Design a protein around this motif. Sequence first.
Motif, PDB file in Angstrom:
ATOM      1  N   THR A   1      12.952 -29.948  37.616  1.00  0.00           N
ATOM      2  CA  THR A   1      13.090 -28.628  37.017  1.00  0.00           C
ATOM      3  C   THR A   1      11.856 -27.794  37.323  1.00  0.00           C
ATOM      4  O   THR A   1      10.729 -28.258  37.137  1.00  0.00           O
TER       5      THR A   1
ATOM      6  N   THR B   1      14.413  -6.990  31.483  1.00  0.00           N
ATOM      7  CA  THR B   1      15.379  -8.011  31.119  1.00  0.00           C
ATOM      8  C   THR B   1      16.087  -8.471  32.378  1.00  0.00           C
ATOM      9  O   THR B   1      16.030  -7.813  33.417  1.00  0.00           O
TER      10      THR B   1
ATOM     11  N   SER C   1      25.309 -18.605  39.928  1.00  0.00           N
ATOM     12  CA  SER C   1      26.065 -18.966  41.115  1.00  0.00           C
ATOM     13  C   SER C   1      25.107 -19.464  42.183  1.00  0.00           C
ATOM     14  O   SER C   1      24.043 -18.880  42.389  1.00  0.00           O
ATOM     15  N   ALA C   2      25.494 -20.541  42.852  1.00  0.00           N
ATOM     16  CA  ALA C   2      24.725 -21.104  43.945  1.00  0.00           C
ATOM     17  C   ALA C   2      25.540 -21.023  45.225  1.00  0.00           C
ATOM     18  O   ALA C   2      26.755 -20.813  45.197  1.00  0.00           O
TER      19      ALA C   2
ATOM     20  N   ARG D   1      26.458 -26.711  45.899  1.00  0.00           N
ATOM     21  CA  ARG D   1      27.320 -26.686  44.727  1.00  0.00           C
ATOM     22  C   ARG D   1      27.362 -28.047  44.050  1.00  0.00           C
ATOM     23  O   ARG D   1      27.396 -29.088  44.708  1.00  0.00           O
TER      24      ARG D   1
ATOM     25  N   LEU E   1      21.516 -26.425  39.049  1.00  0.00           N
ATOM     26  CA  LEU E   1      21.757 -25.605  37.871  1.00  0.00           C
ATOM     27  C   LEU E   1      20.667 -24.554  37.765  1.00  0.00           C
ATOM     28  O   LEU E   1      19.483 -24.865  37.913  1.00  0.00           O
ATOM     29  N   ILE E   2      21.062 -23.309  37.526  1.00  0.00           N
ATOM     30  CA  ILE E   2      20.127 -22.198  37.421  1.00  0.00           C
ATOM     31  C   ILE E   2      20.360 -21.524  36.083  1.00  0.00           C
ATOM     32  O   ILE E   2      21.429 -20.950  35.853  1.00  0.00           O
TER      33      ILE E   2
ATOM     34  N   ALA F   1      18.745 -19.205  32.525  1.00  0.00           N
ATOM     35  CA  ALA F   1      17.852 -18.112  32.172  1.00  0.00           C
ATOM     36  C   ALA F   1      17.911 -17.809  30.685  1.00  0.00           C
ATOM     37  O   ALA F   1      18.977 -17.844  30.070  1.00  0.00           O
ATOM     38  N   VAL F   2      16.748 -17.496  30.131  1.00  0.00           N
ATOM     39  CA  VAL F   2      16.582 -17.052  28.757  1.00  0.00           C
ATOM     40  C   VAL F   2      15.789 -15.756  28.798  1.00  0.00           C
ATOM     41  O   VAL F   2      14.802 -15.651  29.532  1.00  0.00           O
TER      42      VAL F   2
ATOM     43  N   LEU G   1      13.840 -12.111  27.130  1.00  0.00           N
ATOM     44  CA  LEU G   1      12.427 -11.894  26.804  1.00  0.00           C
ATOM     45  C   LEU G   1      12.076 -12.178  25.351  1.00  0.00           C
ATOM     46  O   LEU G   1      11.038 -11.701  24.883  1.00  0.00           O
TER      47      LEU G   1
ATOM     48  N   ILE H   1      12.497 -16.335  31.145  1.00  0.00           N
ATOM     49  CA  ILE H   1      12.311 -17.567  31.892  1.00  0.00           C
ATOM     50  C   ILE H   1      13.588 -17.861  32.652  1.00  0.00           C
ATOM     51  O   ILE H   1      14.663 -17.970  32.054  1.00  0.00           O
TER      52      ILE H   1
ATOM     53  N   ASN I   1      22.994  -4.260  23.710  1.00  0.00           N
ATOM     54  CA  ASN I   1      21.552  -4.227  23.476  1.00  0.00           C
ATOM     55  C   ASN I   1      21.059  -2.798  23.429  1.00  0.00           C
ATOM     56  O   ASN I   1      20.588  -2.318  22.401  1.00  0.00           O
TER      57      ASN I   1
END
Lengths: 131, 97, 95, 276, 107, 118, 118, 118
Positions: free
Chosen positions: A19, A29, A58-59, A64, A68-69, A71-72, A74, A81, D46
Amino acid sequence: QIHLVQSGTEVKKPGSSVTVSCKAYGVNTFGLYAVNWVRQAPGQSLEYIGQIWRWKSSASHHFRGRVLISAVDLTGSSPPISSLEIKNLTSDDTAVYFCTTTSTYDKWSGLHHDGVMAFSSWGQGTLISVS
Amino acid sequence: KKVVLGKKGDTVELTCTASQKKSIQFHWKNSNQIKILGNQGSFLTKGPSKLNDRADSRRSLWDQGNFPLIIKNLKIEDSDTYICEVEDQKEEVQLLV
Amino acid sequence: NLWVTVYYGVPVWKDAETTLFCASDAKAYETEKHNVWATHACVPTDPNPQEIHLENVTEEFNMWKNNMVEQMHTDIISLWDQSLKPCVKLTPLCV
Amino acid sequence: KEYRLINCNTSAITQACPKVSFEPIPIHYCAPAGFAILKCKDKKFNGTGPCPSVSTVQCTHGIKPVVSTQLLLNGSLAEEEVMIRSENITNNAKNILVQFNTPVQINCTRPNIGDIRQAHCNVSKATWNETLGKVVKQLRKHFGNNTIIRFANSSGGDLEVTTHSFNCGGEFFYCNTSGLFNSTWISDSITLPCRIKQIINMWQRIGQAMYAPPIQGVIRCVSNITGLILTRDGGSTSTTETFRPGGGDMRDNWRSELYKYKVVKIEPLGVAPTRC
Amino acid sequence: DIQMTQSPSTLSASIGDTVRISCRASQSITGNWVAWYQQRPGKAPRLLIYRGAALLGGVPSRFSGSAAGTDFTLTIGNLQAEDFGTFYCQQYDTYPGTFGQGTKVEV
Amino acid sequence: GAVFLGFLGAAGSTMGAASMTLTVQARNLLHLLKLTVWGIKQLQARVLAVERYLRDQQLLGIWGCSGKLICCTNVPWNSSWSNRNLSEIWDNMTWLQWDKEISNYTQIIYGLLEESQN
Amino acid sequence: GAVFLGFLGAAGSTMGAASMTLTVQARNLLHLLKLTVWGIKQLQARVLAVERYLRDQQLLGIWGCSGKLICCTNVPWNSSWSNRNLSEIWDNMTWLQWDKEISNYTQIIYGLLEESQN
Amino acid sequence: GAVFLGFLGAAGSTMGAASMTLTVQARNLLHLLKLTVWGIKQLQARVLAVERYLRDQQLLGIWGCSGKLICCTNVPWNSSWSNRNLSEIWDNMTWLQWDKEISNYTQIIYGLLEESQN
Ligand SMILES: *[C@@H]1O[C@H](CO)[C@@H](O[C@@H]2O[C@H](CO)[C@@H](O[C@@H]3O[C@H](CO[C@H]4O[C@H](CO[C@H]5O[C@H](CO)[C@@H](O)[C@H](O)[C@@H]5O[C@H]5O[C@H](CO)[C@@H](O)[C@H](O)[C@@H]5O)[C@@H](O)[C@H](O[C@H]5O[C@H](CO)[C@@H](O)[C@H](O)[C@@H]5O)[C@@H]4O)[C@@H](O)[C@H](O[C@H]4O[C@H](CO)[C@@H](O)[C@H](O)[C@@H]4O[C@H]4O[C@H](CO)[C@@H](O)[C@H](O)[C@@H]4O[C@H]4O[C@H](CO)[C@@H](O)[C@H](O)[C@@H]4O)[C@@H]3O)[C@H](O)[C@H]2NC(C)=O)[C@H](O)[C@H]1NC(C)=O
Ligand SMILES: *[C@@H]1O[C@H](CO)[C@@H](O[C@@H]2O[C@H](CO)[C@@H](O[C@@H]3O[C@H](CO)[C@@H](O)[C@H](O[C@H]4O[C@H](CO)[C@@H](O)[C@H](O)[C@@H]4O[C@H]4O[C@H](CO)[C@@H](O)[C@H](O)[C@@H]4O)[C@@H]3O)[C@H](O)[C@H]2NC(C)=O)[C@H](O)[C@H]1NC(C)=O
Ligand SMILES: *[C@@H]1O[C@H](CO)[C@@H](O[C@@H]2O[C@H](CO)[C@@H](O[C@@H]3O[C@H](CO[C@H]4O[C@H](CO)[C@@H](O)[C@H](O)[C@@H]4O)[C@@H](O)[C@H](O[C@H]4O[C@H](CO)[C@@H](O)[C@H](O)[C@@H]4O)[C@@H]3O)[C@H](O)[C@H]2NC(C)=O)[C@H](O)[C@H]1NC(C)=O
Ligand SMILES: *[C@@H]1O[C@H](CO)[C@@H](O[C@@H]2O[C@H](CO)[C@@H](O)[C@H](O)[C@H]2NC(C)=O)[C@H](O)[C@H]1NC(C)=O
Ligand SMILES: *[C@@H]1O[C@H](CO)[C@@H](O[C@@H]2O[C@H](CO)[C@@H](O)[C@H](O)[C@H]2NC(C)=O)[C@H](O)[C@H]1NC(C)=O
Ligand SMILES: *[C@@H]1O[C@H](CO)[C@@H](O)[C@H](O)[C@H]1NC(C)=O
Ligand SMILES: *[C@@H]1O[C@H](CO)[C@@H](O)[C@H](O)[C@H]1NC(C)=O
Ligand SMILES: *[C@@H]1O[C@H](CO)[C@@H](O)[C@H](O)[C@H]1NC(C)=O
Ligand SMILES: *[C@@H]1O[C@H](CO)[C@@H](O)[C@H](O)[C@H]1NC(C)=O
Ligand SMILES: *[C@@H]1O[C@H](CO)[C@@H](O)[C@H](O)[C@H]1NC(C)=O
Ligand SMILES: *[C@@H]1O[C@H](CO)[C@@H](O)[C@H](O)[C@H]1NC(C)=O
């Protein structure tokens, strides 16, 4: 003033997972921007991996099921991240990784073509070796 | 960066400066990200710090872009890096007592 | 073979930062200061608004970089400078 | 010129002061011929990001020019949940706009010795507590599992931002919202002492103004609190978080009602292939 | 995807020398969907030119670009010492984007 | 001159559905002193809308396409302008994607449409 | 309707340069009681300009040339109307010389352009 | 926009005489507070006439016949629409008799004239 920062140099075992973090300082954002993960084998040219534009992970077709991609946004005390997980490592994924971000706010920009993007702002490099 | 020294008690002045002459929003913070001052429109807001009572800014200078900070009663606990945030020019000065 | 076909009525946007006029329907017989202002500086309503709901489009809005806020802010500066006339002002110059 | 002691002649203008009436009507900001105003119909939007349910209107909805600090009076209401909007969370200097889903009604009354500089405001307790409960749920959805300890008092500074300043009947009420914000949050009615003050700071620009002495009798200010404006405290090495109210920048009042909109230009002329 | 071909694979020039680097697509990119990157060694590749000839904001205006459907021409005028790095051409026309090969400009 | 909004309902859908919606939504969508000021401001809205429509028809008047909602000119495509199978044009694209894609060729096409009236 | 002056910049030059300047200068050139009277008088200027433009387009509407800046009709020249090699027309003459020269044939040409829509 | 009455002089006569009268009668027929209200009401008459004329030209704009007083389209008659020798049409009938006779076919003809611009 995007000052995108990644994690450090890592080394793993074949047949494993890994990771890589991507903290996006100065990014409003990930609804407005879009993160494109790309890599570079040592000596080779830059090889695309995947993206999360408009919160749709999407990769590419080479990767495939293995990648895994996530995101979280702000929220609170941490910048946005993105994160890159690789399952079932081989010894042919030893590479310098990059997360990149580009702005998708203006439709008539030219940096992006329906989710296929030029990479306007870059990380600094996360080397992964496999032993 | 800038370095500004003081001794005790007397006033000391720190400055932001914008280049638009528009009285835009600024904030003065410290190293631990505690607020010291804040423009709110054309109003002043202090912050929950030890400079809650002792900090001040000249209000009439904001229309000319200049955003000062005036600290009175310089004690020993007021020696820290103070940060302008105006638009992006996160200016850093360091106060010495 | 195949060649240029000029159309008209094409659904294409841009962005704008333009002039943009008030308002609703005031009374035009009252001494309420918002009614006096909205009379002397705005137009009446139109009882048939045209809300066209769009198809599968996806715009990306940005609330914090909007050029509509500054314009109604200037209009309310005008409203409050024309309605509530103070007894004494103290505004600096700094020439 | 010249050069640090720039000549700040604090000028003064004296005009007549008739006691005026004051009650804000809604305002529809229309776009001219050739333009159009988009609109986000997403109920949980938002403020940034992609909005998939875009509609198109010619003119906006009813927007009341209501000027107030620390509380958004007579505003509009969110459709589904209490929304929390900010330019940059983690900045600790940007005003967190909190929009409610239910109006918390407030009664600011000046009764009739009769102590003309005195009024009081009533907020329905246990309607207010439910509202702060929903707000703390959404703030924990942003922040995690922290203790909101506490909604504090205003930190100080100017008079118009420390207190719930507003206008009602042409008289400027400066309340005291200290009792309305005092609660830590582990995971009958309230009276607010609200004076009437008359050497005001202008919000239009940098200045001060003086108004007429107050009016004859009973002043009624039946309103709706449909918003908040909060700030934060940075640091330190989890801890608990403290949300002092703030405000004063009046454009934060108009990024709560011009929130859904965007102005576009319609270019109707395109070219294409044929089979002519 | 649509494979690119960068030319030449290696050149070298001096300070103040106009350098022309071409990039040829296997298809025709009518719409100019070609980016150009510079990578200095040990760093991340910054963007130089998007849409064939649109110049980015934080870029010195010495550079120029050209697009002719299949040939994409990057032209450096008054070459400096800072501009000595591996270049790349990107086709971001069709998904997925793929890059060039690397024109390692040296002295 | 309030039919500028009715153009936009066909955004997001592809180019053929928008071309049908052109014809469909074009056929379907057709003494106090403080009051004379309202009358004058509403007339300054309406006459401005009429003048903007006439200017838009005069810019179609150069190209021989004034009044026509759809016209088919006599300027052949140099096929370096979206060298694309036009099934993919009229089925896989929207108009926003055209205004993005041939943006660097549009002044050329306008110059050719002006020059092909001589 | 203020583009009537921009027509006149091509006077004095010959007919071909004026015909190019047509397309070029057409593409490039596109509550007190005493104040409502100014508003009404400016609207009576603007609406009058719009009505004069629409009347000028209706007089081109008879001949099948409404909206077109340049149209090429179907009325053949009887060659007793300026029996002249048209190199000399488009190179040695200005428009004032045409309005002087074929002035006695212009009602005939207008009658033929009206009658050739039947 | 006062030429709507001049249309009606050719009623009662047959269709060919009315078609000639089209071209002929088209070529030939071309600060007190209580006074600003008259100025505004006369402008609201004139601008309304101009807008009604532009709407009538936009409804001819769908069919490729904007501005033309007479146009000849490309929609062939299914001959179950007044199966009649057209000498009898243009000599024995008036326009009121046409609006009575093909009244049940006119929406069909309008749909075909809209659909034959695609
Ligand atoms: C304004 O309001 C907005 C709402 O109105 C709000 O928008 C919302 O924002 C939030 C964030 O704030 C968004 O939530 C995040 O969404 C991310 C994207 O998720 C999408 O994609 C993933 C991945 O899907 C791929 O794989 C699955 C496999 O099952 C396939 O099914 C998919 O098709 C897809 O596969 C394709 O692509 C692959 C490559 O990725 C290819 O390999 C493959 O071949 C295919 O091509 C999906 O899982 C998501 O679906 C899930 O959620 C939807 C609904 O949202 C459900 O319908 C669905 O059932 C699923 O539940 C979605 O499609 C997420 O990645 C992200 O998830 C993180 O957080 C959640 C908790 O929030 C965790 O549970 C989760 O594990 C992730 O956390 C990991 O990563 C973070 C850092 O990123 C770490 O801190 C954390 O520790 C954790 O790491 C762990 O796992 C990592 C890998 O997962 C690993 O690397 C680590 O080592 C560690 O183990 C999160 O859900 C939300 O979607 C937005 N919603 C909307 C509607 O917009 C907006 O933010 C607000 N804005 C502001 C300014 O406030
Ligand atoms: C949020 O919105 C609500 C409405 O949706 C706003 O509530 C309204 O508030 C206004 C003013 O606060 C209030 O208007 C008053 O209504 C009273 C009842 O009808 C009137 O009596 C009063 O008029 C008196 O004062 C006027 C101002 O001078 C005079 O012009 C008028 O003649 C009256 O004055 C008489 O009595 C005074 C006593 O001092 C004496 O001086 C005079 O000589 C004269 O004898 C106002 O019209 C509305 O009724 C309220 N509406 C509701 C439903 O409550 C609320 O204010 C908004 N919130 C904010 C912050 O704006
Ligand atoms: C919203 O508000 C938040 C504030 O909470 C802003 O976040 C700050 O953003 C700035 C940049 O805008 C960040 O500053 C940058 O930090 C980079 C990394 O340092 C961090 O990580 C290291 C390693 O873990 C830590 O040791 C360190 O303490 C930091 O945590 C630096 O690399 C950057 O420096 C680079 O650029 C500067 C430019 O002046 C150069 O001088 C340097 O040499 C170097 O090249 C830079 O310092 C800051 O860290 C963020 N702080 C926080 C608390 O998040 C967001 O930017 C803001 N977002 C928006 C849209 O406004
Ligand atoms: C607003 O009300 C609060 C609470 O009543 C005042 O804060 C202090 O309250 C205590 C009792 O709880 C009193 O003993 C103090 O005298 C109050 N003042 C101070 C300065 O500590 C608060 O002062 C009121 N606001 C204003 C502006 O006076
Ligand atoms: C393709 O079109 C884009 C948009 O018109 C052009 O991009 C602009 O280029 C100029 C410099 O020539 C810059 O100043 C602008 O900032 C660019 N971007 C935009 C969005 O306008 C680009 O030059 C064109 N490329 C080619 C090959 O013609
Ligand atoms: C406000 O509250 C006090 C105390 O509950 C009460 O006596 C008073 O009647 C209330 N005023 C109004 C207008 O409700
Ligand atoms: C506010 O006043 C209104 C009308 O006087 C009354 O119906 C309502 O109950 C009051 N609310 C509170 C909390 O006092
Ligand atoms: C407010 O209500 C919540 C539950 O809704 C309760 O836990 C809390 O103790 C109440 N707060 C006060 C101050 O009464
Ligand atoms: C805020 O409230 C606290 C506690 O009630 C009090 O000590 C303080 O003086 C108040 N300050 C202001 C500025 O209202
Ligand atoms: C908050 O202040 C109120 C008075 O306004 C007081 O009754 C309450 O006890 C305080 N709570 C805390 C935790 O100090
Ligand atoms: C307060 O909110 C309610 C919500 O329906 C609304 O009906 C009422 O008119 C509002 N009061 C005002 C605007 O004074």
